[PDB]
Enzyme design. Sequence first.
Site, PDB file in Angstrom:
ATOM      1  N   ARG A 162      -8.895  -8.887   4.168  1.00  0.00           N
ATOM      2  CA  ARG A 162      -7.752  -8.489   5.107  1.00  0.00           C
ATOM      3  C   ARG A 162      -8.026  -6.879   5.350  1.00  0.00           C
ATOM      4  NH1 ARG A 162      -2.545  -6.159   4.167  1.00  0.00           N
ATOM      5  NH2 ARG A 162      -0.997  -6.717   5.767  1.00  0.00           N
TER       6      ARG A 162
ATOM      7  N   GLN B 295       0.756  -1.331  -0.103  1.00  0.00           N
ATOM      8  CA  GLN B 295       0.016  -0.031   0.094  1.00  0.00           C
ATOM      9  C   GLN B 295       0.810   1.044  -0.146  1.00  0.00           C
ATOM     10  OE1 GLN B 295      -4.041  -0.589   1.482  1.00  0.00           O
ATOM     11  NE2 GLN B 295      -2.864  -1.124   3.188  1.00  0.00           N
TER      12      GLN B 295
ATOM     13  N   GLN C 285       2.156 -11.047  11.331  1.00  0.00           N
ATOM     14  CA  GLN C 285       2.381 -10.029  10.355  1.00  0.00           C
ATOM     15  C   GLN C 285       1.532  -8.726  10.609  1.00  0.00           C
ATOM     16  OE1 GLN C 285       2.957  -8.951   5.619  1.00  0.00           O
ATOM     17  NE2 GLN C 285       1.114  -9.072   6.598  1.00  0.00           N
TER      18      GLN C 285
ATOM     19  N   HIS D  22       0.181  -2.801  11.732  1.00  0.00           N
ATOM     20  CA  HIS D  22       1.534  -3.501  12.217  1.00  0.00           C
ATOM     21  C   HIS D  22       1.876  -3.305  13.850  1.00  0.00           C
ATOM     22  CE1 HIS D  22       1.976  -5.219   8.540  1.00  0.00           C
ATOM     23  NE2 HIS D  22       1.701  -3.853   7.954  1.00  0.00           N
TER      24      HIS D  22
ATOM     25  N   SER E  39       4.506  -5.963   3.418  1.00  0.00           N
ATOM     26  CA  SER E  39       3.214  -6.332   4.065  1.00  0.00           C
ATOM     27  C   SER E  39       2.163  -6.696   2.960  1.00  0.00           C
ATOM     28  CB  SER E  39       2.612  -4.718   4.396  1.00  0.00           C
ATOM     29  OG  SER E  39       1.560  -4.801   5.214  1.00  0.00           O
ATOM     30  N   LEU E  40       1.333  -6.059   2.293  1.00  0.00           N
ATOM     31  CA  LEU E  40       0.380  -6.698   1.198  1.00  0.00           C
ATOM     32  C   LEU E  40       1.369  -7.319   0.321  1.00  0.00           C
ATOM     33  CD1 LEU E  40      -0.673  -5.996  -1.829  1.00  0.00           C
ATOM     34  CD2 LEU E  40      -2.293  -7.359  -0.082  1.00  0.00           C
TER      35      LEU E  40
END
Length: 305
Positions: free
Chosen positions: A115, A9, A248, A199, A90-91
Amino acid sequence: QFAFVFPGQGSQTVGMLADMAASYPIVEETFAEASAALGYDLWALTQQGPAEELNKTWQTQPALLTASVALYRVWQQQGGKAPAMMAGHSLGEYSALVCAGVIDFADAVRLVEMRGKFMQEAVPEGTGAMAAIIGLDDASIAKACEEAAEGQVVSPVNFNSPGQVVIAGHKEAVERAGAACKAAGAKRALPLPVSVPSHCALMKPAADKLAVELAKITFNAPTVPVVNNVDVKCETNGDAIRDALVRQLYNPVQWTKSVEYMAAQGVEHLYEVGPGKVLTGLTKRIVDTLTASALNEPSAMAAAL
């Protein structure tokens, strides 16, 4: 050896991959497959937006995942050779797991929409915040966060390069930590336009809901090692990978250490397989012995094959 890295993102822009789609039909074919799983035209959303629609996170995450898998399919279709390993921010870790054969593409498109929904609803609007801290070492940032917490949550959540760390948590604790980092020598504390405090510990309820969904999906063994964000480890076991994806969500993304691990394994070039050039720009700041380039323009793709 080269590795493929996949952006998260922040890398999306309306109109992304328009030139690649024009040279390679498989890009729009991959988006058509994702549109059939989602029930709306995902290609039209990436090309027309508007930008606030593309930035709603349950729409941003399918869009970025599909954009990265479309570019990987171009590479494969054209006879490109397998990377030595893969990693994603991340993604982007989900895009890496699809390309490595662990999760089926249609399953992953539905999963990252979910998600985004769980993330969006984890915390009330206006409760959380995120900010980038520039020019301060990691240890001092962690100390500034510890002093500023004051009964709330504020943590370093993305270690992107030496000198570039994103922190997240409750809105007020993030403002206090930013001030404290500035006082300790940080060049800048930039608030990010996100209210979801990704996170950090406040995401734990969303991670619990995600764990239930991950259990319903078949996981296959990776065909290429994927270095995960939470532990900087390559796992093959379905339950170990599922656990790494759950943790994560409420733990720091260790991007600096992932790139250092790839270099220690002999990787000497990173190709960024997604929109933008964000991970390409961080590479030299982590190890300037590594080179990096992005595979999102037809010229660059042709030069790379």
